[PDB]
Design a protein around this nucleic acid. Structure first.
Lengths: 118, 112, 112, 118
DNA sequence: CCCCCCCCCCCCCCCCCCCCCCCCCC
DNA sequence: CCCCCCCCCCCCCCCCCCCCCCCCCC
């Protein structure tokens, strides 16, 4: 219970956001946030980056057009949304992946600057 | 590149916590939290099922305190994992940091 | 402009939960979660103290199940509030959605 | 326990980010996120926006310069960080406010587009 | 610390993003 | 379902951001 399960992710888009449409004209954007744990000593005596988390994201409407206009592969982003499960297909009788249904996203300003325009 | 992705989940254990032991003898408890959105409105909207892992002393306490159907509050960090299983799939799991039975519909006698 | 700001807090009740009743007779429980960062490293880094509010049946269960020093997992949404108090200050508080005693150092007998 | 208490906030800066410095040259930016619950029926029979949450934020280093270069009063932002208490002063024997120590922030792309440049 | 669910209202108690300054501002 | 804390490993169970499509990609 307690409504949906929300989540915030920070990471980089593994690719350019795929923008697609509905016969009525509603935009939906799809992309994946690769989240790599930095300074997460895991293997040998030394230290570096840890294994990565890849979450596929969905976003709709105006924001979808903005996501596609504003972001590309490699962009560092801050994302909030809610985790949704989906039963997917072809090679997998009744597949199932988790996905984030985005509420808000933006390019992080840790290593980059940004011009904000409507 | 960015810390550990945290998550809080509230829901019900789909079963009793499976308790096991790692090679060095670390107590590990596994279980799955079924999270159902209460939600013209629907009722039984699409539930979310997350597999959880928890270690050491807490694993023992979870195994001693919780059962199938227990409503729980869980915080931890999402981790992705791959696994062969007869020559390989990839599932997201929660590495639990804290978990407790929820007090919304129940009372609890804590043994500190 | 943006939904309700949620928060999860883990820590210890600074005292026993104060139970009270609203004019219509709604059960409301208040208490404060002291959250201490474990942390060349320090030890008793600056603790965070958050006042919590919880309502109805859960308030009763909290008051029946929890005491000063109980370690708890809490989720809710941050709310700001102003108050006269002898002609006015403004404090942030958590409106609890779920709370439970943590199973990290303790076991719990849930009464579903 | 469990390390720090993290938080994600979405909202608008009540003002332009105040940028300041340290004798050594480290940038720190301060600003406040006004978070207004939208579609949160509270008073009369009708519905609209609910009462607002104002959290003062702190951010350091490079990001602080980027925040100050990129954002202004009214900007909608996504913020993640950790809640910190502080004992503040003048008119208040030993004051105390909560504050967010920002880890990442960015302009939300719900109602705006953005050019990302390093 | 259990009196029927509309809104009492104070931030004080134990080895699962860490080096650095202002009054809560629709 | 309690065998000493390094890493077993499957997403299946009840009135506190809601109108809309792909294989987990450092």
């Amino acid at each position: 219970m307690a409504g949906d399960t929300t989540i915030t992710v920070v990471g980089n888009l593994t690719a350019d956001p795929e923008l697609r449409f509905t016969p009525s004209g509603a935009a939906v954007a799809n992309f994946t946030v690769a989240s790599t744990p930095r300074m997460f000593d895991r293997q040998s005596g030394e230290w570096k980056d840890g294994e990565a988390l890849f979450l596929r994201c969905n976003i709709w409407r105006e924001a979808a057009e903005n996501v596609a206009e504003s972001l590309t592969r490699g962009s560092r982003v801050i994302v909030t949304g809610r985790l949704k499960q989906r039963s997917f297909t072809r090679e997998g009788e009744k597949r199932t992946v988790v996905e984030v249904e985005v509420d808000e996203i933006g390019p992080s300003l840790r290593y980059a600057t940004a011009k904000v325009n409507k």
